[PDB]
Design a protein around this ligand. Structure first.
Ligand SMILES: Cc1cc(C#N)cc(C)c1Oc1ccnc(NC2CCN(Cc3ccc(S(C)(=O)=O)cc3)CC2)n1
Lengths: 398, 554
């Protein structure tokens, strides 16, 4: 086994990312993990000649797991993992009755990493109250979290999967970062049996959400128009505004007749013939997907989240603003619920397009940066920005 | 000596070659001094004579006082040399330090000159001592050790020091060593005799690695002054703060005052710097005298009272819990204390930050909690239990209804007035028996003239003219009008999301005069219901205001 040469491009320097302060228990957990990885020769202590840095976190059941934030490196290594060695996405995955996610990141530890690239995988275990310099390391093997790891390994993954794929032609396997996405139209019992069969194939070779995923059942959350016995001026105004913003997305939406009826908000106005028809006609448009919107593989996916109150969260995935590719919902505390939603939306985004979306988070940067790791369970991290949710967009999406 | 430790491999920046900077002809005194200084360094193995083949050069200078010092200008080589990892991420806070029975301060002798340089890099440190009037070839020398003023020296010295200390640290886990530049701070719980022996063991381990230290008769004693603090055996404080008595304060004097107060605020509770910082606004000459406002004079007097008596801080005990308390000490001003045992503070602090344009006390307190949370994780690696001047019901009513996700760790209400409260609450549904004001505002983008007005279900109409205003301003002046000309209960319809968004967030403080005028009106009212409609959609009421508001080109 020999190394695959990795390149960033003629330009573009490596990552120089700050390490967010970690808790005592998280630091200790990392030193235990890293001492074992050093001994096993997976990572090596580094000198100051390596100016690079990638953040590290410790996540969970009871056992601690090391999570490296390779977002900057993945961004800076795009030519390698995407254009040069791209893993193709199957359109069939989203159509399967049941999809199973299995962690395969332990396979990357058996493969060495290009000596000339190693320096870019530099990370720091910080010390409490800056009392000690801070433990510096770099990877010797393909690191979990880096998008270059499955790009290099794909050739070895194909050999492992070759018999299982031949014996099961209707089963679809997709490799995304440290996970395998296994889809089938089989009955749940048979599906689970085939998952255990695949685990054994991986055992030789050395290897929110729920038990499985059901993407064939993934329906969009339609923009809901209230069904009222009595309608006040205010009710119409809310309905006029909601439909007006929906007309920007859905081709065919009409407000004209509803607009036709200086009055007090509390005053009741009777529901006219053509407006009742318009409302029923718009209702039918919102049920079906948006006409004219298609996924551009060269464009970045963007996701917006709205806190709906009472443990309810709404979300939309788009490339061009308000042109929705998917809309949906998620059902103890605000941050815990939000991290659960982010992970769920990312899991769907991977299944459907083979890419993660950039999140527009309705939270203060600092609050999120402090707490996200406390509830996070995924091997990956999506891109995120901190946004102030416009008050209207929450109301328009229920 | 020169440490036997393996060299750190150095490289130049990718597309760069070593410096080839011409040596300027120097004075005879300077040439004499440099030769003298260089001969002693060469004899110690710090530098080595080189041939004419080496093409790299860095300029040298000599400055005098009776002693002469060698000054190498590494500006060019530093530009060409690679980047290095940051020496240290931060400085320890005294509040985070655990009690240690005995303390010794050791200083490394000729630190950089005691650490070897990468053999492959040595050539780049080449310098020439010019001959009298540069007539004959000069004396060519290269560094074998870390040169003073070179980019890689601070990083390479610390890593070497960290590598050297590693075996000692492992062999002595109960001993504490703090590395900072040429200094070494050793602490232990061992009794005076046992400690002094372990110090010597360390000095001997350091000598075994080419590093000299001062002997037991040269070390520091009484109350340890470290990094701007006074470290006593069982307590800590900041170094003495002299608040100068001045009849006239220059920009520079105020700048220094604020820094000294901000430094004092780590242990002195209630320190305020707001009114003094207001005097720093305006960008004036540093020597310029600024007349103190009554508010600043009052603030300076309140600070002088806090600093009249010395206040101390306690050290960290990992067995006990961390408790953080916050108090509102004016508008936008927040004060905090962190302790383990009631009122025996580990540290103190303040928060005053206008995140965005408009805010309320509930948002400000949450932001203050967040600032302390991060701070606590840095200093102690854990979050404290908070004691807040807000009712659990005020917090619950706020967070559940607010669009933003807000989560604060384990906390309890403490009745320390002023209390955090919501000054007004907007209605969930429209009000019956209340006048509905349809408002609108439109300003001419060229003439800057604006028109704010309203139309009501009760028949009332009013239009006012505004000078040098934006559309953002007119839509805001329109809501202010509706609040000014209305009674205790009101319904307000706007086509501005900007105005809606601000008002919906329940602000009680703002940068804008208009917003604070609106706030003042919102508190007075008994009931207010704010609604939004899309502009230019032919909506009854909205279309009526638009007509009388757009009149005069808009
Ligand atoms: C950052 C730092 C600065 C100085 C200095 N400078 C000394 C040391 C070892 C130091 O590093 C650390 C690391 C962990 N815990 C502590 N614990 C400290 C808690 C405060 N004591 C204060 C103290 C003062 C005098 C004596 S004496 C005069 O009794 O030996 C004992 C303790 C020093 C260790 N200090």
């Amino acid at each position: 086994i020999e190394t695959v040469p990795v390149k960033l491009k003629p330009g573009m320097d490596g990552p120089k990312v700050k390490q967010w302060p970690l808790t005592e228990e998280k630091i200790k957990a990392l030193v235990e993990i890293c001492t074992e990885m050093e001994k096993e020769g997976k990572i090596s202590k580094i000198g100051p000649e390596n100016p690079y840095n990638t953040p590290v976190f410790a996540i969970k059941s009871t056992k601690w797991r090391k999570l490296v934030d390779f977002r900057e490196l993945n961004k800076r290594t795009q030519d390698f993992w995407e254009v040069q060695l791209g893993i193709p996405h199957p359109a069939g995955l989203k159509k399967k009755k049941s999809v199973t996610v299995l962690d395969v990141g332990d396979a990357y530890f058996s493969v060495p990493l290009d000596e000339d690239f190693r320096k870019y995988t530099a990370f720091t275990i910080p010390s409490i109250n800056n009392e000690t310099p801070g433990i510096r390391y770099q990877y010797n093997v393909l690191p979990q979290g880096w998008k270059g790891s499955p790009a290099i390994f794909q050739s070895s993954m194909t050999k492992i999967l070759e018999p299982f794929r031949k014996q099961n032609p209707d089963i679809v396997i997709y490799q995304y970062m440290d996970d395998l996405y296994v889809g089938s139209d089989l009955e749940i019992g048979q599906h689970r049996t085939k998952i255990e069969e695949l685990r054994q194939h991986l055992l030789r070779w050395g290897l929110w959400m729920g038990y499985e995923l059901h993407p064939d059942k993934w329906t969009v959350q339609p923009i809901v128009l209230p069904e009222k016995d009595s309608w006040t001026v205010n009710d119409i105004q809310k309905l006029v505004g909601k439909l007006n913003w929906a007309s920007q997305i859905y081709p065919g939406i009409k407000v004209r007749q509803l607009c036709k009826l200086t009055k007090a908000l509390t005053e009741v106005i009777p529901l006219t013939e053509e407006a009742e028809l318009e409302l029923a006609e718009n209702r039918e448009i919102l049920k079906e997907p948006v006409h004219g919107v298609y996924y551009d593989p060269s464009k970045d996916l963007i996701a917006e989240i709205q806190k709906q109150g009472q443990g309810q969260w709404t979300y939309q995935i788009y490339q061009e603003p308000f042109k929705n590719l998917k809309t949906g919902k998620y059902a103890t505390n605000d941050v815990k619920q939000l991290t659960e939603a982010v992970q769920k939306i990312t899991t769907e985004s991977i299944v459907i397009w083979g890419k993660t979306p950039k999140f527009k988070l309705p939270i203060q940067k600092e609050t999120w940066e402090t707490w996200w790791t406390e509830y996070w369970q995924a091997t990956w991290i999506p891109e995120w920005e901190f946004v102030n949710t416009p008050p209207l967009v929450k109301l328009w999406y229920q | 000596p020169i440490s036997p430790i393996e060299t750190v491999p150095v490289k130049l920046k990718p597309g760069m070659d070593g410096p080839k900077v011409k040596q300027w002809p120097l004075t005879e005194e300077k040439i004499k001094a440099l030769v003298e200084i260089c001969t002693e360094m060469e004899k110690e193995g710090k530098i080595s004579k080189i041939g004419p083949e080496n093409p790299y050069n860095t300029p040298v200078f000599a400055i005098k006082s009776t002693k002469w010092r060698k000054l190498v200008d590494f500006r060019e080589l530093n530009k060409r040399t690679q980047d290095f990892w940051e020496v240290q991420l931060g400085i320890p806070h005294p509040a985070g330090l655990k009690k240690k029975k005995s303390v010794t301060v050791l200083d490394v002798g000729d630190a950089y000159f005691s650490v070897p340089l990468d053999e492959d890099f040595r050539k780049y440190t080449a310098f020439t001592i010019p001959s009298i009037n540069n007539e004959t070839p000069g004396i060519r020398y290269q560094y074998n050790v870390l040169p003073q003023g070179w980019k890689g020296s601070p990083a390479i010295f610390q890593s070497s020091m960290t590598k050297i200390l590693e075996p000692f640290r492992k062999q002595n886990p109960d001993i504490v060593i703090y590395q900072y530049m040429d200094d070494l701070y050793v602490g232990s719980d061992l009794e005076i005799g046992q400690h002094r022996t372990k110090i010597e063991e360390l000095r001997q381990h350091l000598l075994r690695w080419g590093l000299t230290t001062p002997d037991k008769k040269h070390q520091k004693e009484p109350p340890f002054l470290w990094m701007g603090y006074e470290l006593h055996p069982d307590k800590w404080t900041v170094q003495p703060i002299v608040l100068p008595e001045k009849d006239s304060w220059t920009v520079n004097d105020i700048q220094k005052l604020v820094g000294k107060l901000n430094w004092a605020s780590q242990i002195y509770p209630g320190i305020k710097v707001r009114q003094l910082c207001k005097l720093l606004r305006g960008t004036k000459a540093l020597t310029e005298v600024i007349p103190l406002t009554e508010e600043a004079e009052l603030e300076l007097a309140e600070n002088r009272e806090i600093l009249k008596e010395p206040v101390h801080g306690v050290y960290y005990d990992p067995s006990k819990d961390l408790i953080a308390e916050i108090q509102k000490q004016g508008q936008g001003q927040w004060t905090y204390q962190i302790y383990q045992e009631p009122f025996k503070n580990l540290k103190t602090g303040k928060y005053a930050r206008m995140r965005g344009a408009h805010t309320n006390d509930v948002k400000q307190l949450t932001e203050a909690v967040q600032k302390i949370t991060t701070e606590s994780i840095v200093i102690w690696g854990k979050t404290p239990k908070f004691k807040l001047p807000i009712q659990k019901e005020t917090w619950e009513t706020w967070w559940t209804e607010y669009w933003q996700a807000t989560w604060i760790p384990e906390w309890e209400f403490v009745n320390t007035p002023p209390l955090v409260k919501l000054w007004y609450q907007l209605e969930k549904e429209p009000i019956v028996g209340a006048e509905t004001f349809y408002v609108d505002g439109a300003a001419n983008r060229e003439t800057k003239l604006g028109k704010a007005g309203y139309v009501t279900n009760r028949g009332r109409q009013k239009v006012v003219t505004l000078t040098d205003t934006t559309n953002q301003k007119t839509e805001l002046q329109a809501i202010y009008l509706a609040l000014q000309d209305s009674g205790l209960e009101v319904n307000i319809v706007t086509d501005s999301q900007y105005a809606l968004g601000i008002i919906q967030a329940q602000p009680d403080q703002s940068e804008s005069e208009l917003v604070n005028q609106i706030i003042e009106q919102l508190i007075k009212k008994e009931k207010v219901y704010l609604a939004w409609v899309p502009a230019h959609k032919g909506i009854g009421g909205n279309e009526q205001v638009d007509k009388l508001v757009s009149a005069g080109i808009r």
